[PDB]
RNA sequence: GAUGUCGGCUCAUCACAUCCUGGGGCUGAAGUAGGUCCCAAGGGUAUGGCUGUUCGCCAUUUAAAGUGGUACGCGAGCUGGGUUUAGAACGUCGUGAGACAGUUCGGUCCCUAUCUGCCGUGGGCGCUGGAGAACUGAGGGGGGCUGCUCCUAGUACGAGAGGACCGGAGUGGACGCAUCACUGGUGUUCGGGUUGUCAUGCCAAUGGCACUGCCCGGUAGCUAAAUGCGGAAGAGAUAAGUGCUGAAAGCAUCUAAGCACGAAACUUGCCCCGAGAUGAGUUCUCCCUGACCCUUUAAGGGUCCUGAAGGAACGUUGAAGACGACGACGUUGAUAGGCCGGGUGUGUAAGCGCAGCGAUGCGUUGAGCUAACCGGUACUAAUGAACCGUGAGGCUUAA
RNA sequence: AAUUCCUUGUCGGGUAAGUUCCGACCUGCACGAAUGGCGUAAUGAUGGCCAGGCUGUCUCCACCCGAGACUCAGUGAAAUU
RNA sequence: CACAGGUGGUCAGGUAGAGAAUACCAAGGCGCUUGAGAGAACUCGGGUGAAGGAACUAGGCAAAAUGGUGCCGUAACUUC
RNA sequence: AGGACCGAACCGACUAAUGUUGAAAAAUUAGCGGAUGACUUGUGGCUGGGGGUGAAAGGCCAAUCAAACCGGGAGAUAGCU
């Protein structure tokens, strides 16, 4: 798959910050309303990361007005502008789907200092 | 992804707390109502002394689903519950004034502008 | 579930026309021992491609 | 106008600046070398035979070897034919490249679909399964009734039943051309196309458009 | 549907399959030549060759991995003491399958599997 | 000397007396919306509450929820609610045994497919010297549904209320094909956590067993809920219908001659199969260019030499496959396993050191391990051979 | 009504929609007092109805693990005709 | 029938467990008298399942689910 | 204390699937009722066919029951096939 690898790495971004599941992350995504274009911030907990080169994605959860909201960003999409790690969390699993069942004080993640 | 018999929360101050979808409007043999799709609902729980009351049959619009919406770049927005906004039968305007919880841009159509205007997010 | 009419000798033979056994086309001769063997199988004495790779 | 023969490298996507993701099949089309021109007089219709790829010099047989030597081209992995639309001309030995699809907006892609083998009626024909419970005896995915009672007294020809599925010629029509790359000999086409990765594909301009 | 799948079921459940290949790998390492069925030898390739490859670098962790996959300290000792040094210059291909006719009892195709330099 | 009954499920198929969509005449057709009649069977043609129900009522839909035939289609396809056994009870009748086209509760549905048929897939021979490909296309099958919104246009029409034809664009529902880039499901062949117990001499570490013990994730593949595509346009001949010219019959008249339109119906155009199309077709390429005998002389038989092109067989095998078959490869070699590198997944191995009384924590360390994946690599296995297939291919006439 | 033909009687409750169920009524075709009448706590592999939970029952099926099915070697039936 | 059935009484180890339940083991005894492959339809016995959650059906049939110990709390009605 | 409660052995048999030329002329798997009693079970005995026995189903009386099985009257009779 040399050809597909070349086509993909032609488009892969370069400035993707390193982050791990359990890290609180802010994602700035472009939004178009009519003709104007603007940035919208989505801040939440990284609960899943899929590493597949150009097809890499990651899910971010936030409690928006009582109800949870999960957004699965595609890390190399031009729609997503910047990613920033706001807090380094300490977990032991690659995927944190148990936070769906958890709520409140139980949903806290210890901060990392490694 | 909303069918018949499925329970929905209410994301408005019309009074109803929980409603049940009894027909997915559109075409014949249509299966599912996604976000932005009109449904026929029956009210199963309502606060006393509200605009609507238990047992009422009227229309609603799906504004949140657990199945989520897909964006053109391929992202998915999922929610922890399915919620709708009640509408009048013959005018399709919302019954209530306030909208609670976020919505999506799939309601960016000339008819749901009043929902988008008073939504707290998106 | 079951016949209504007894099938014949003729139909029996026609059904059995595909039961013939295919004899072995040609046996391979070992270069060292000269024994006949199935191709890609070792000889009865334990040779294969001229080498005696068998304990016995 | 004529098409070309390539292979299914696989599936990827193209991100556009607008924020959309386009799923593309990558079709590798090398130079199609013309091995024979058919004309109305000798053959009865206007066509060009083409070959592509390489083939082992020991696995090319003498008949095909001489057929390629007649046109003076190297032996490929097969031979395909394309009908000429009454205005175009080709000569034996010419090499047609991917640049033929420089201006083509939509294409039709023909290939051999993935083979599913012996397929039951539920999978092959979208038959609805009977009840999994409520007394059902050994009749969960069975086809059900297959005819009337003794007035026809027969099963009608062409009835939907179980059998071989896939591994058959399939064409997908009116697929957008996303990118035509001469240097790397590539054609990116929107959407899935028939067959497995590494299988031969015939790409023509769209007939309907 | 078997598209691009690996491994033969061999008409056994996974537990029996693992136990059988553990025993058979022990036998092959012990004797250096065993008569089995042809498909069983084809799978014994995949079971035994990774173990000999593991037996190249002699460390306690590799010893414990080999013991986890073999459950025979004699086999682990023979691997790390003899077959590691023996095959240390070979890039795979530690084994050889020779077809040897059919079994009388059930007409099953038979094969000898051997270590490529046993000298016995 | 047995043709299983009602309803339901699965699967359907024809008719047309058309339910929707198309074409048209009239209208008590101003417009929207209708009614009625004629042509039209291509495609489409509800979900639930109640009841054993078909029906029916009701709720909510749809463009529409057509009417009938097919053993009131369909039990060697399913069910067994109802009817139509044996138990029991109520009302009624009868002195009673019992009975009831009253009601109630309960109450065994067998069949391994020989033939026809049908869906798939092979072997043989044939097609006239053999073989390898690529085709033409006679013929056959598939497919053909439609809503809503906006523009034309608040125009035509209309006192207003309302409100188009024709044409154009977008966006949907149901259906169909393909596929795995994405979102997911699965993933008892990958990693980890943990309970009980046995074990490897013991600690430590691992293994077995308990539904994969129970769980948490998750590769490739397969897959839908995921995402691409499609139904056409066009042409020809027409149905009802509309006409132009035009006599019989000085006029009039679509018709008698002649001419022009006219529908989702027909034939094509779209996709698939397709030369056993025995009417067995066409094109390109490859191959075989030796002597003798015999006699019922013929498209005859026999011995020796020769055995080509190719095939088949065998082996390593496949995103091909029930088995055949089909594709790739066999040392002039990447065909399979291994190996190396990467990738992905899991989530910081073991050993050791340090802290703590200890559970345990920190460092080495994003570590160890990692199936099917990607790129490479002859390490192992794909053998010198043998086998089938011949030796120029009939007659007649004609150029 | 285990009893009511007309009958899906009427009104109400519950459902968006209730021939079933619950409550009341009384024109009881054709209840009724030890072939017992009317109630009744507890008991029931008892009939009917409703609700929470739960779910592949279902929309609509997908993938997986085993036993057959399929091929190979051995042995080798049956109904029926 | 070398047949998944029936057949009275006695013996009763360890770990966990209320237990003669149950799991893993000891003594002791067995792998059940056709096998080898392959990994289609379909059938049988199981595992998991997005969104919904009885819309299935004559009927929640069947499945899913609950399930232990201690403490707290415990309705109508009742023959107390 | 209890014809008390949950639950193994033991006794049974409500539902479903399988099987129905079955592994089995009534069973298997998963669930299910009782489980100190009107319980269950071994050994022996008694009741005999117009008879027995029956917490009563015309149930059971050796895979046979609105009148067992064996032998006989007997070649019953058969306006029927
Ligand atoms: Mg079943």
Interface check D117 vs E, CB under 8 A: yes
Q: Which two tokens stand for residue B63?
A: 């504004």
Interface check A34 vs B, CB under 8 A: no
- Nearest nt (C1') to C1 (CA)? F113
Alpha carbon of A62: minimum distance to chain B alpha carbons (Å): 10
Q: Which two tokens stand for residue E86?
A: 């023996």
Q: Which residue in this structure is represented by tokens 């990116």?
A: D188
Residue A43: name the closest of D195, C39, B47, B121 by CA: B121
| Chains E and A touch, contact meaning at least 3 pairs of CB atoms under 8 angstroms apart | no
Residue B36: name the closest of B122, B108, B121, B118 by CA: B108
D57 CB neighbours strand F below 7 A: yes
Q: What 3-state DSSP class applies to B45?
A: strand
Q: Which residues of D82-99 are buried (b: 16+ CB within 10 A; e: fewer)?
A: bebeeeeebeeebebebe
State whether the Cα torsion B92-B98-B100-B105 is positive or negative.
Answer: positive
- Residues in B 49-108 whose C-beta is less than 7 A from nucleic strand G are 54-55, 57
Which residue in the set E33, E99, E114 is minimally distant from C41, CB to CB? Answer: E99
Interchain pair E98, C38: CB under 8 A: no
Beginning with the edge strand found earlier in the chain, give each strand of the sheet holding A24-33 in spatial order. Answer: A80-87, A24-33, A36-50, A57-64, A67-74, B76-79, B69-70
Residues of chain B contacting D20 with CB distance shorter than 8 Å:
72-73
| CA atom of B95 to C1′ atom of F82, Å | 49
Residue C52 CA to residue D104 CA, distance in Å, equals 66
C3 CB neighbours strand I below 7 A: no
In this structure, chain C runs to a length of: 56
The domain segmentation of chain D, as residue ranges, is 1-209
E86 phi and psi, to 5 degrees?
-65, -50
> Which domain CATH number covers B24?
2.40.150.20
Resolution to 1 decimal, in Å? Answer: 2.5
Residue D124's alpha-carbon distances to D117, D120, D168, E1, E4, in angstroms, are 10, 6, 13, 14, 22
| Chains C and B touch, contact meaning at least 3 pairs of CB atoms under 8 angstroms apart | no
Task: Please name the CATH architecture into which domain E13-115 falls.
Answer: Alpha-Beta Complex (3.90)
Residue E47's alpha-carbon distances to E13, E53, E92, in angstroms, are 17, 11, 13
Interchain pair B74, A74: CB under 8 A: yes
User: Best of E2, E3, E4 to disrupt the D interface by mutation (most D CBs within 10 Å)?
Assistant: E3
Residues of chain E contacting D116 with CB distance shorter than 8 Å:
1
Interface check E3 vs D, CB under 8 A: yes
Q: Identify the closest residue of chain E to D118 by CA–CA distance.
A: E1
* Number of C-beta neighbours around residue E76 at 10 A: 24
With distances taken from each CA to the C1' atom of nucleotide F147, the closest residue turns out to be B27
> Domain residues for B80?
1-122
The domain segmentation of chain C, as residue ranges, is 1-56
A44 phi and psi, to 5 degrees?
-170, -170
Residue D177 CA to residue D136 CA, distance in Å, equals 51
Interface check E108 vs C, CB under 8 A: no
Interchain pair C42, E112: CB under 8 A: yes
Q: Identify the closest residue of chain D to A74 by CA–CA distance.
A: D21
Q: Which residue in this structure is represented by tokens 């080709």?
A: D90
- Nearest nt (C1') to D138 (CA)? H43
Residue D113 CA to residue D167 CA, distance in Å, equals 5
Q: Identify the closest residue of chain A to B121 by CA–CA distance.
A: A64
Domains: count for chain B:
1
| CA atom of C24 to C1′ atom of F293, Å | 37
Q: Which residue in this structure is represented by tokens 């079951």?
A: C2
D135 CB neighbours strand I below 7 A: yes
Alpha carbon of B75: minimum distance to chain D alpha carbons (Å): 10
- Residues in D 88-147 whose C-beta is less than 7 A from nucleic strand F are 108, 110, 113-118, 125-128, 130-131, 134-139, 142-147
SS (H, E, C) chain E: CCCCCCCCCCCCCHHHHHHHHHHHHHHHHHHCEEEEEHHHHHHHHHHHHHHHHHCCCCCHHHHHHHHHHHCCHHHHHHHHHHHHHHHCCCCCCCEEEEEEEECCCCCCEEEEEEECCCCC
E20 CB neighbours strand F below 7 A: no
With distances taken from each CA to the C1' atom of nucleotide H44, the closest residue turns out to be D138
Residue A111 CA to residue A114 CA, distance in Å, equals 10
Tell me whether strands B83-87 and B7-10 are parallel, antiparallel or unpaired.
parallel
| Chains C and E touch, contact meaning at least 3 pairs of CB atoms under 8 angstroms apart | yes
Residue B53 CA to residue B19 CA, distance in Å, equals 11
> Domain residues for A106?
1-114
Q: Which residue in this structure is represented by tokens 């008073």?
A: B118
The domain segmentation of chain E, as residue ranges, is 13-115
Domains: count for chain A:
1
Residues of chain B contacting A70 with CB distance shorter than 8 Å:
68, 76-79
Cα-to-centroid distance, D119 and ligand 1 (Å): 20
In this structure, chain E runs to a length of: 120
Residue B50: name the closest of B90, B119, B118, B96 by CA: B96
DSSP D128: P
- Nearest nt (C1') to D120 (CA)? H41
Interface check E1 vs D, CB under 8 A: yes
Experimental method: cryo-EM
DSSP A105: G
What are the beta bridge partners of residue D50?
Answer: D34, D80
Residue D57 CA to residue E76 CA, distance in Å, equals 49
Q: Yes or no: say if D75 and D63 are a contact pair by the CB < 8 Å rule.
A: no
* Number of C-beta neighbours around residue E36 at 10 A: 19
Q: Quick one: angle between helices E38-54 and E60-70, nearest 10? A: 160
């Amino acid at each position: 798959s040399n050809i597909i690898k070349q086509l993909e790495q032609e488009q892969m971004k370069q400035d993707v910050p390193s982050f791990r599941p359990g890290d609180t992350v802010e994602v700035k995504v472009w939004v178009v309303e009519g003709s104007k274009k603007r940035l919208q911030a989505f801040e939440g907990v990284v609960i899943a990361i899929r590493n597949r080169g150009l097809h890499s994605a990651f899910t971010v959860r936030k409690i928006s007005n009582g109800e949870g909201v999960e957004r699965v960003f595609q890390t190399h999409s031009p729609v997503v502008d910047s990613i920033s790690v706001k807090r380094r969390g300490a977990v032991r699993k690659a995927k944190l789907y148990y936070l769906r069942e958890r709520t409140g004080k139980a949903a806290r993640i210890k901060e990392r200092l490694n | 992804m909303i069918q018949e018999q499925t329970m929905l929360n209410v994301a408005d101050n019309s009074g109803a707390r929980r409603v049940m979808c009894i027909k997915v409007l559109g075409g014949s043999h249509r299966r599912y109502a996604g976000v932005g799709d009109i449904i026929k609902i029956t009210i199963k729980e309502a606060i006393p002394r509200g605009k609507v009351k238990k047992g009422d049959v009227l229309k609603a619009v799906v504004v949140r689903t657990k199945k989520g919406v897909r964006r053109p770049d391929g992202s998915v927005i999922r929610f922890d519950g399915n919620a709708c906004v009640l509408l009048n039968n013959n005018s399709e305007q919302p019954i209530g004034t306030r909208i609670f919880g976020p919505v999506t841009r799939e309601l960016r159509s000339e008819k749901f502008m009043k929902i988008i205007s008073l939504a707290p997010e998106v | 579930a079951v016949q209504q009419n007894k099938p014949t000798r003729s139909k029996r033979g026609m059904r059995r026309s595909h039961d013939a056994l295919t004899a072995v086309t040609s046996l391979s001769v070992d270069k060292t021992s000269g024994e006949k063997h199935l191709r890609h199988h070792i000889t009865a004495d334990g040779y294969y491609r001229g080498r005696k790779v068998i304990a016995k | 106008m004529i098409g070309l023969v390539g292979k299914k490298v696989g599936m990827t996507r193209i991100f556009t600046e607008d924020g959309v993701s386009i799923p593309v099949t990558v079709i590798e089309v090398e130079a199609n070398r013309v091995t024979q021109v058919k004309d109305l007089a000798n053959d009865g219709y206007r066509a060009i035979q083409v070959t592509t790829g390489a083939k082992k010099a020991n696995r090319v047989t003498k008949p095909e070897a001489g057929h390629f030597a007649k046109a003076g081209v190297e032996a490929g992995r097969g031979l395909w034919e394309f009908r000429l639309a009454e205005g175009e001309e080709f000569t034996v030995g010419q090499s047609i490249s991917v640049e033929l699809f420089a201006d083509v907006k939509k294409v039709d892609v023909t290939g051999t679909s993935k083979g599913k083998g012996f397929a039951g009626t539920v999978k092959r024909w979208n038959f609805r399964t009977q009840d999994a419970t409520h007394g059902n005896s050994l009749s969960h995915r069975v086809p059900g009734s297959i005819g009337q009672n003794q007035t026809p007294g027969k099963v009608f020809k062409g009835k939907k039943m179980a059998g071989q599925m896939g591994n058959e010629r399939v064409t997908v029509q009116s697929l957008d051309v996303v990118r035509v790359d001469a240097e790397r000999n590539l054609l990116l086409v929107k959407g899935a196309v028939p067959g497995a990765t590494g299988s031969d594909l015939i790409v023509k301009p769209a007939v309907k458009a | 549907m078997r598209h691009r799948k690996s491994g033969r079921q061999l008409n056994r459940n996974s537990s029996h399959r693992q136990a059988m290949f553990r025993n058979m790998a022990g036998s092959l390492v012990r004797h250096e030549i065993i008569k089995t069925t042809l498909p069983k030898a084809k799978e014994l390739r995949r079971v035994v060759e990774p173990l000999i490859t593991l037996a190249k670098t002699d460390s306690v962790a590799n010893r414990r991995l080999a013991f986890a996959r073999t459950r025979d300290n004699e086999i682990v000792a023979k691997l790390f003491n003899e077959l590691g040094p023996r095959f240390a210059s070979r890039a795979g291909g530690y084994t050889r399958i020779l077809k040897c006719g059919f079994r009388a009892g059930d007409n099953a195709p038979m094969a000898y599997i051997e270590l490529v330099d046993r000298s016995e």
